[PDB]
Amino acid sequence: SGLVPRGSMESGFTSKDTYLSHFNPRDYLEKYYKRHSAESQILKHLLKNLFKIFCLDGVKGDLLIDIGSGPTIYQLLSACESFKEIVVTDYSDQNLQELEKWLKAAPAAFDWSPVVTYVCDLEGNRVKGPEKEEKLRQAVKQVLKCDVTQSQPLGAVPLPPADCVLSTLCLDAACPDLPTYCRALRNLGSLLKPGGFLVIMDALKSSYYMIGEQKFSSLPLGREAVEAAVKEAGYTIEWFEVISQSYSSTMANNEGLFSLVARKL
Numbered sequence: 001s002g003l004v005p006r007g008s009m010e011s012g013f014t015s016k017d018t019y020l021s022h023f024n025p026r027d028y029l030e031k032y033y034k035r036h037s038a039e040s041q042i043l044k045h046l047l048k049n050l051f052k053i054f055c056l057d058g059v060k061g062d063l064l065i066d067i068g069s070g071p072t073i074y075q076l077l078s079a080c081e082s083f084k085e086i087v088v089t090d091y092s093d094q095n096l097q098e099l100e101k102w103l104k105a106a107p108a109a110f111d112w113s114p115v116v117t118y119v120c121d122l123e124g125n126r127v128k129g130p131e132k133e134e135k136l137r138q139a140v141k142q143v144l145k146c147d148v149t150q151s152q153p154l155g156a157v158p159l160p161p162a163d164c165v166l167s168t169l170c171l172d173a174a175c176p177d178l179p180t181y182c183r184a185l186r187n188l189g190s191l192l193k194p195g196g197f198l199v200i201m202d203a204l205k206s207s208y209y210m211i212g213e214q215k216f217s218s219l220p221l222g223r224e225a226v227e228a229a230v231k232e233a234g235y236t237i238e239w240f241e242v243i244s245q246s247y248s249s250t251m252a253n254n255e256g257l258f259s260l261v262a263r264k265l
């Protein structure tokens with residue numbers, strides 16, 4: 001069936017258990033992070049932006065919790081230069097397994113070398129590709145289970161309050177409505193130190209995203225709804241950027257991406 005995304009017939013939005021069953025890390029990785037495609041340009045945009053946030057701006061500290069990491073590590077590459085400890089998390093178990101293969105530098109794991117090299121050229125080439133992946137691997141401390149829709153996102157796992165909370169291309173997929181988007185930001189706040197940083201980068205006006213022929217739901221947010229929901233979840237925006245570049249017609253109906261850096265009140 002392709003009339004409605006998988007797991008959305010009864011409710012209207014993809015169910016969380018749909019991510020445990022029909023989400024495949026290998027195809028998600030090959031589809032978006034594997035010539036100079038729409039996806040390659042988007043990745044270059046999120047990387048250049050993460051380089052500005054973590055290396056040019058004042059976003060440094062001890063703990064950075066990454067929420068809904070999937071099987072990806074592109075989003076951590078520049079943060080490992082400013083954060084002493086990273087905690088990668090996700091709801092889908094198979095994604096945490098794909099991340100644990102990467103921490104182990106297993107041969108079965110996905111090859112992030114083109115992305116690592118690109119980030120090294122962004123950072124002025126102080127180090128090479130292999131030295132960079134090793135610094136990130138050491139910085140990743142725990143691999144955790146995650147549910148944004150819970151007052152305690154990481155269950156009973158006792159973690160010190162974080163200096164920053166990163167969340168790339170996840171909240172739109174996780175939150176079925178605006179109240180859930182608001183409640184989920186407040187829950188991420190339960191991990192943040194007072195005045196701690198909230199970093200999000202996600203699609204704009206997208207009702208879906210594809211994994212081959214697997215349609216997955218996305219909350220079609222507008223720039224103003226993002227600004228409004230963030231402010232109302234107990235945060236103050238510092239920086240808000242919107243680029244008009246979209247994913248390929250065949251994989252998503254987004255009308256650009258957004259990226260913000262908010263601070264918890």
Ligand SMILES: Nc1ncnc2c1ncn2[C@@H]1O[C@H](CSCC[C@H](N)C(=O)O)[C@@H](O)[C@H]1O
Binds near residue numbers: 148
């Ligand atoms: N309720 C929930 N809580 C936490 N993560 C969730 C969730 N529902 C879905 N997700 C996760 O959201 C992710 C969307 S893919 C995002 C992958 C990655 N952060 C990137 O930058 O591309 C999936 O890995 C899925 O497991």
Ligand SMILES: CCn1c(=N)n2c3c(cccc31)CCC2
Binds near residue numbers: 206209253254
């Ligand atoms: C990076 C691939 N991908 C992703 N994880 N999300 C996407 C959205 C739109 C387009 C493409 C997307 C919104 C939901 C979450």
